Design an enzyme around this catalytic site. Structure first.
Site, PDB file in Angstrom:
ATOM      1  N   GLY A  55       0.822  -1.224   0.000  1.00  0.00           N
ATOM      2  CA  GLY A  55       0.000   0.000   0.000  1.00  0.00           C
ATOM      3  C   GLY A  55       0.846   1.260   0.000  1.00  0.00           C
ATOM      4  O   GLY A  55       2.086   1.151   0.047  1.00  0.00           O
ATOM      5  N   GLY A  71       0.401   5.728   1.210  1.00  0.00           N
ATOM      6  CA  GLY A  71      -0.353   6.835   1.829  1.00  0.00           C
ATOM      7  C   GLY A  71       0.304   8.173   1.548  1.00  0.00           C
ATOM      8  O   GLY A  71       1.285   8.197   0.779  1.00  0.00           O
ATOM      9  N   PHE A 106       2.115   9.805   3.546  1.00  0.00           N
ATOM     10  CA  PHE A 106       3.393   9.841   4.306  1.00  0.00           C
ATOM     11  C   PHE A 106       4.136   8.501   4.193  1.00  0.00           C
ATOM     12  O   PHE A 106       4.752   8.081   5.196  1.00  0.00           O
ATOM     13  CB  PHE A 106       3.117  10.211   5.767  1.00  0.00           C
ATOM     14  CG  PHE A 106       2.086  11.295   5.954  1.00  0.00           C
ATOM     15  CD1 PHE A 106       2.339  12.595   5.544  1.00  0.00           C
ATOM     16  CD2 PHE A 106       0.856  11.014   6.535  1.00  0.00           C
ATOM     17  CE1 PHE A 106       1.387  13.590   5.712  1.00  0.00           C
ATOM     18  CE2 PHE A 106      -0.095  12.011   6.701  1.00  0.00           C
ATOM     19  CZ  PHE A 106       0.173  13.296   6.290  1.00  0.00           C
ATOM     20  N   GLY A 107       4.091   7.853   3.021  1.00  0.00           N
ATOM     21  CA  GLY A 107       5.042   6.788   2.644  1.00  0.00           C
ATOM     22  C   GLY A 107       4.386   5.539   2.080  1.00  0.00           C
ATOM     23  O   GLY A 107       3.141   5.506   1.960  1.00  0.00           O
ATOM     24  N   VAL A 148       4.090   1.137   2.260  1.00  0.00           N
ATOM     25  CA  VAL A 148       4.029   0.015   3.243  1.00  0.00           C
ATOM     26  C   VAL A 148       4.564  -1.241   2.555  1.00  0.00           C
ATOM     27  O   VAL A 148       4.027  -1.600   1.489  1.00  0.00           O
ATOM     28  CB  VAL A 148       2.597  -0.201   3.768  1.00  0.00           C
ATOM     29  CG1 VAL A 148       2.571  -1.140   4.965  1.00  0.00           C
ATOM     30  CG2 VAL A 148       1.916   1.119   4.103  1.00  0.00           C
ATOM     31  N   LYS A 202       6.535   0.531   7.248  1.00  0.00           N
ATOM     32  CA  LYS A 202       6.220   1.842   6.625  1.00  0.00           C
ATOM     33  C   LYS A 202       7.522   2.634   6.488  1.00  0.00           C
ATOM     34  O   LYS A 202       8.084   3.022   7.531  1.00  0.00           O
ATOM     35  CB  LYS A 202       5.193   2.629   7.449  1.00  0.00           C
ATOM     36  CG  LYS A 202       4.763   3.954   6.828  1.00  0.00           C
ATOM     37  CD  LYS A 202       3.442   4.485   7.339  1.00  0.00           C
ATOM     38  CE  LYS A 202       3.546   5.155   8.693  1.00  0.00           C
ATOM     39  NZ  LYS A 202       2.235   5.211   9.382  1.00  0.00           N
ATOM     40  N   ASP A 245      -7.396  11.638  11.255  1.00  0.00           N
ATOM     41  CA  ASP A 245      -7.313  10.960   9.930  1.00  0.00           C
ATOM     42  C   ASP A 245      -8.046   9.609   9.978  1.00  0.00           C
ATOM     43  O   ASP A 245      -7.523   8.638   9.405  1.00  0.00           O
ATOM     44  CB  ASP A 245      -5.853  10.814   9.479  1.00  0.00           C
ATOM     45  CG  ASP A 245      -5.659  10.711   7.972  1.00  0.00           C
ATOM     46  OD1 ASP A 245      -6.657  10.848   7.232  1.00  0.00           O
ATOM     47  OD2 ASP A 245      -4.504  10.505   7.545  1.00  0.00           O
ATOM     48  N   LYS A 264     -10.372   6.995   8.612  1.00  0.00           N
ATOM     49  CA  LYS A 264     -10.846   6.600   7.260  1.00  0.00           C
ATOM     50  C   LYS A 264     -10.647   5.090   7.084  1.00  0.00           C
ATOM     51  O   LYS A 264      -9.915   4.492   7.892  1.00  0.00           O
ATOM     52  CB  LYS A 264     -10.113   7.408   6.184  1.00  0.00           C
ATOM     53  CG  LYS A 264      -8.600   7.246   6.151  1.00  0.00           C
ATOM     54  CD  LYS A 264      -7.930   8.180   5.160  1.00  0.00           C
ATOM     55  CE  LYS A 264      -6.433   7.982   5.067  1.00  0.00           C
ATOM     56  NZ  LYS A 264      -5.887   8.611   3.843  1.00  0.00           N
TER      57      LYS A 264
HETATM   58  C1  LIG Z   1      -2.083  -0.652   3.750  1.00  0.00           C
HETATM   59  O1  LIG Z   1      -1.334  -1.630   4.471  1.00  0.00           O
HETATM   60  C2  LIG Z   1      -1.495  -2.986   4.327  1.00  0.00           C
HETATM   61  C3  LIG Z   1      -1.925  -3.582   3.144  1.00  0.00           C
HETATM   62  C4  LIG Z   1      -2.066  -4.967   3.082  1.00  0.00           C
HETATM   63  N1  LIG Z   1      -2.451  -5.819   2.088  1.00  0.00           N
HETATM   64  N2  LIG Z   1      -2.394  -7.141   2.585  1.00  0.00           N
HETATM   65  C5  LIG Z   1      -2.780  -8.188   1.635  1.00  0.00           C
HETATM   66  C6  LIG Z   1      -4.245  -8.471   1.823  1.00  0.00           C
HETATM   67  O2  LIG Z   1      -4.867  -7.731   2.564  1.00  0.00           O
HETATM   68  N3  LIG Z   1      -4.817  -9.498   1.179  1.00  0.00           N
HETATM   69  C7  LIG Z   1      -5.956 -10.215   1.755  1.00  0.00           C
HETATM   70  C8  LIG Z   1      -5.597 -11.692   1.815  1.00  0.00           C
HETATM   71  O3  LIG Z   1      -5.265 -12.130   0.503  1.00  0.00           O
HETATM   72  C9  LIG Z   1      -4.112 -11.456   0.001  1.00  0.00           C
HETATM   73  C10 LIG Z   1      -4.413  -9.969  -0.147  1.00  0.00           C
HETATM   74  C11 LIG Z   1      -1.992  -7.139   3.857  1.00  0.00           C
HETATM   75  C12 LIG Z   1      -1.773  -5.766   4.179  1.00  0.00           C
HETATM   76  C13 LIG Z   1      -1.337  -5.219   5.388  1.00  0.00           C
HETATM   77  C14 LIG Z   1      -1.165  -3.840   5.487  1.00  0.00           C
HETATM   78  N4  LIG Z   1      -0.787  -3.153   6.645  1.00  0.00           N
HETATM   79  C15 LIG Z   1      -0.363  -3.617   7.819  1.00  0.00           C
HETATM   80  O4  LIG Z   1      -0.224  -4.808   8.105  1.00  0.00           O
HETATM   81  C16 LIG Z   1      -0.156  -2.530   8.831  1.00  0.00           C
HETATM   82  C17 LIG Z   1      -0.031  -2.832  10.180  1.00  0.00           C
HETATM   83  C18 LIG Z   1       0.091  -1.803  11.104  1.00  0.00           C
HETATM   84  C19 LIG Z   1       0.072  -0.483  10.684  1.00  0.00           C
HETATM   85  C20 LIG Z   1      -0.079  -0.203   9.329  1.00  0.00           C
HETATM   86  C21 LIG Z   1      -0.136   1.201   8.840  1.00  0.00           C
HETATM   87  O5  LIG Z   1       0.145   2.164   9.863  1.00  0.00           O
HETATM   88  C22 LIG Z   1       0.845   1.402   7.703  1.00  0.00           C
HETATM   89  F1  LIG Z   1       2.074   1.130   8.094  1.00  0.00           F
HETATM   90  F2  LIG Z   1       0.506   0.586   6.722  1.00  0.00           F
HETATM   91  F3  LIG Z   1       0.768   2.662   7.318  1.00  0.00           F
HETATM   92  N5  LIG Z   1      -0.199  -1.230   8.441  1.00  0.00           N
END
Ligand SMILES: COc1cc2nn(CC(=O)N3CCOCC3)cc2cc1NC(=O)c1cccc([C@@H](O)C(F)(F)F)n1
EC number: 2.7.11.1
Length: 282
Positions: free
Chosen positions: A26, A28, A30-31, A33, A46, A141, A143
């Site tokens: 992903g 955002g 501010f960067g 992931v 991140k 923020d 959302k």
């Molecule tokens: C935007 O971020 C993510 C996107 C993702 N996509 N997937 C794959 C997915 O969801 N699928 C479903 C199953 O089948 C395969 C496809 C896992 C993801 C995990 C993500 N984030 C985190 O785990 C996480 C944890 C703690 C903090 C933060 C945020 O503060 C950050 F850092 F993203 F800004 N993110």
């Protein structure tokens, strides 16, 4: 919580591979992931990057200071950071089901969320926001992109870079979600409620908050049209559910409608939002 070498994070993310599945999950304001593996654990990394000046370091310390020792059922978990190399990095417990936004849109061919799972996700998110407001924190923020989902589709609030403990000149947030007063630079927990109101609309409709190609483009204008009897909620209920009943949907819309009062002082507080969402599933 501990300090990571920039080079360990660089290594376990395949040199920050910007290709999706690749390591990019992903992106955002501010960067980016990245998916990684450290300490026998799958993690989210991140890499912070700019709009934003050297203020990105101020959001880096802000999030560390707020989340370093925080543990709630409905908040993401920060495992550590990196500031010893090229870019600032935050490391979290991996959320295998990603963002509510992505699951509502069924990104990568994931099956639609049932009304049952949607109700549990709304209650959890509100429980996450309640914890922050109790501890006199404002998110700024709220959302669907900042509500992440774990292995049990438990809702985890994320991205505390802009969090605070009032007027400001530097107005920041996502405009599709932002309360009117928040756009004028006001900082209040009542702004978070308005934004949550929009998240509930996303949950009921499965529609993104903004769609350039849509009439109307902003989801909170669909709410206004429903209130002026120009549309009905029934016409905008997500077609990608088999287990949605009129009563519970209309009850959630009622919460969203109360949340989206343009006058902040008329909006329910988070405790009231929690209660009305509980009575929805009882
Ligand atoms: C935007 O971020 C993510 C996107 C993702 N996509 N997937 C794959 C997915 O969801 N699928 C479903 C199953 O089948 C395969 C496809 C896992 C993801 C995990 C993500 N984030 C985190 O785990 C996480 C944890 C703690 C903090 C933060 C945020 O503060 C950050 F850092 F993203 F800004 N993110």
């Amino acid at each position: 919580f501990h300090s990571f070498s920039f080079y360990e994070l660089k290594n376990v993310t395949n040199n920050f591979d910007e290709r999706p599945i690749g390591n990019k999950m992903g992106e955002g304001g501010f960067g980016v992931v990245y998916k990684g593996y450290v300490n026998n654990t799958t993690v989210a990394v991140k890499k912070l990057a700019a709009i934003t000046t050297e203020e990105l370091k101020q959001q880096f310390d802000q999030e560390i200071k707020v989340m370093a020792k925080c543990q709630h059922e409905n908040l993401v978990e920060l495992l550590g950071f990196s500031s010893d190399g090229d870019d600032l990095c935050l490391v979290y417990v991996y959320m295998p089901n990603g963002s509510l936004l992505d699951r509502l849109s069924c990104l990568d061919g994931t099956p639609p969320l049932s009304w049952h799972m949607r109700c549990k996700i709304a209650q959890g998110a509100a429980n996450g926001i309640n914890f922050l407001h109790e501890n006199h924190h404002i998110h700024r923020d709220i959302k669907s992109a900042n509500i992440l989902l774990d292995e049990a589709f438990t809702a985890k609030i994320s991205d505390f870079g802009l969090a605070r403990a009032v007027m400001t000149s530097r107005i920041v947030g996502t405009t599709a979600y932002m309360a009117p007063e928040a756009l004028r630079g006001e900082i209040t927990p009542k702004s978070d409620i308005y934004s949550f109101g929009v998240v509930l609309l996303e949950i009921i409709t499965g529609l993104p908050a903004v769609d350039e190609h849509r009439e109307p483009q902003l989801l909170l204008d669909i709410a206004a049209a429903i209130e002026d009897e120009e549309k009905t909620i029934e016409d905008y209920i997500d077609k990608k559910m088999n287990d949605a009943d009129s009563t519970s949907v209309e009850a959630m819309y009622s919460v969203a409608s109360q949340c989206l009062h343009e006058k902040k002082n008329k909006r329910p507080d988070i405790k009231k939002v929690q209660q009305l969402l509980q009575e929805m599933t009882a």
